[PDB]
Design a binder for this molecule. Sequence first.
Ligand SMILES: c1ccc2c(-c3cn[nH]c3)ccnc2c1
Ligand SMILES: c1ccc2c(-c3cn[nH]c3)ccnc2c1
Ligand SMILES: [Ca+2]
Ligand SMILES: [Ca+2]
Ligand SMILES: [Ca+2]
Ligand SMILES: [Ca+2]
Lengths: 115, 113, 113, 115
Amino acid sequence: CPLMVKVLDAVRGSPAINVAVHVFRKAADDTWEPFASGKTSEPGELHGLTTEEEFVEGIYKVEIDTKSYWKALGISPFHEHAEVVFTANDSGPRRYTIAALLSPYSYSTTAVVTN
Amino acid sequence: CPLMVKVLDAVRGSPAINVAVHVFRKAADDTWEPFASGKTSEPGELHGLTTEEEFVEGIYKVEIDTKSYWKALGISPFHEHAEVVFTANGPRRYTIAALLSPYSYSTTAVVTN
Amino acid sequence: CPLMVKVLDAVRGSPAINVAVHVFRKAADDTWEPFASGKTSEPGELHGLTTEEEFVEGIYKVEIDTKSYWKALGISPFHEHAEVVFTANGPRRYTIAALLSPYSYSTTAVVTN
Amino acid sequence: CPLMVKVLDAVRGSPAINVAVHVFRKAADDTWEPFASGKTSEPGELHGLTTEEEFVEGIYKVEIDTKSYWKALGISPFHEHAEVVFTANDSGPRRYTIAALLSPYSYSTTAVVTN
Ligand SMILES: c1ccc2c(-c3cn[nH]c3)ccnc2c1
Ligand SMILES: c1ccc2c(-c3cn[nH]c3)ccnc2c1
Ligand SMILES: [Ca+2]
Ligand SMILES: [Ca+2]
Ligand SMILES: [Ca+2]
Ligand SMILES: [Ca+2]
């Protein structure tokens, strides 16, 4: 599982469940092509986005739909999404975990990259 | 002014100076149209991006060129940039604050009357 | 001044106003001795805590009363407080910045010449 | 496992390994009594600090020795530790994960509390 996303809620002190996550890859024409998408489970994790075969080198964007998350909880948030854009696999295949921490007016993300 | 960006560096414990920042507004075709840009000053701040007349409601993206910042310091970065996307909806001033590390960033909004 | 504290609220997207802050310096018995305190102002800042003469090298704790802040807003908090502990070691100014959520906080130091 | 600690390194993009963690509990005399301690493993986690029997209500302090961590990596950091102080189990037993993200001049922590 070369790409995993974990999302926590800093208001409620809980995993963020049912958060939609969209991954794009920069194409040769310099536009964002759809790559993979999914939704977080009860523990706030999203596994199975991609495979070692599909996850080639490239510039990837992970868009976490934090807006819909907050709105479903009845809160009107600031940001449209939480994100990372990063170059992947440039020095060979890595495993990437994108960890996001959410509040209505703030987010942070971290990458954990292992070999 | 109605929009200010502030950038701090969590590695060096300092303001992030000479960071390039671009702001875009979402147009009707769902593309991003350049709106304003500049480079942070010694206190890590970027003032004078826009004006009350120009800064209308809509969806904005603040792109902070973090990769160039880290490369200039000789520190290996993860992210291409940081992209901070928000909707602007009485009298208001917005500050977009970012705290930078090589493999992480954090951003908050400070919206005041 | 040599030590400033700045507090932001990640829930409301605002400066954290009227937050109590206490600073302590570690004495030889490894106890904490009150050094300075105050409450944040409208921009979420606390200036005038100490003086150049008073602020010597040593180990300091900045305790931010986050639980009282969240209770005053009617928002359920996790932490008792936030305790920010650091060593103070040429010409320097320190800013201790904190970003608050009910179940999380983040803190950074901005150390400038 | 009622209390778990997870520590990530925001500079290297990795779990923070071999980080010492000390937990204290406020005693009836209002001093901090030692409660439990341990060190993070390869994935940056510390399990087995305590048990359901031992982890009673109380005010707890978790001190993560971030200073020794950075110094072992040859870096001189700002903070002595990363921490939380919190009241635990006041509305009955909960499971607590304390998630910490470290940089040389900054840290953040989050609590994940489940029933
Ligand atoms: C450990 C440390 C941090 C986290 C985060 C996080 C992102 N920003 N600050 C914290 C999200 C998800 N899991 C984590 C486990
Ligand atoms: C802790 C302390 C500061 C922040 C900032 C920030 C930039 N200027 N004032 C604060 C932005 C994002 N996260 C932070 C976490
Ligand atoms: Ca390559
Ligand atoms: Ca409006
Ligand atoms: Ca010295
Ligand atoms: Ca009770």
